[PDB]
Amino acid sequence: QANQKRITTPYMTKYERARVLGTRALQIAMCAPVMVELEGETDPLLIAMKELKARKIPIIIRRYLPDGSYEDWGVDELIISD
């Protein structure tokens, strides 16, 4: 599939947001480096949401198409609504 033309939505779905936040929160809880600055946050979920708001989550969403191909979107490339 041509990465120059990705047909899927440029928005992050609610399910993508949910799973990305959960995954990154688990990664933080397992002592992964944090990409944003931290005032006093110790809850991995809060840190993951701060990273998502900052657009600094190092995860790629591989969206599968019904035909079998896939499209890779960086979390910073998608439009975060909520």
Partner 1 sequence: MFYHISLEHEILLHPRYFGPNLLNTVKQKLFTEVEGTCTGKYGFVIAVTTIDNIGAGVIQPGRGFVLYPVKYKAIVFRPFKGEVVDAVVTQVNKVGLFTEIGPMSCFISRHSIPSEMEFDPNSNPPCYKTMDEDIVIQQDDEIRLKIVGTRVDKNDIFAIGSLMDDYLGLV
Partner 2 sequence: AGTGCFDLLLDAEKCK
Binding footprint of partner 2 on the chain (CB under 8 A):
15-16, 18-20, 23, 33, 35, 56, 58-64, 70, 72, 74-76
- Cβ nearer to partner 1, comparing 3 with 81: 3
CB count in 10 Å sphere of residue 41: 16
CB of residue 46 vs partner 2: minimum separation in angstroms? 20
**DSSP string over 2-37:** -TTS--S-SBPPHHHHHHHHHHHHHHHHTTPPPSS-
What does 30 interact with, of partner 2, partner 1, none (CB < 5 to 8 A by kind)? partner 1
- Cβ nearer to partner 2, comparing 43 with 64: 64
Mapped onto helix, strand or coil, the DSSP state of residue 73 is strand
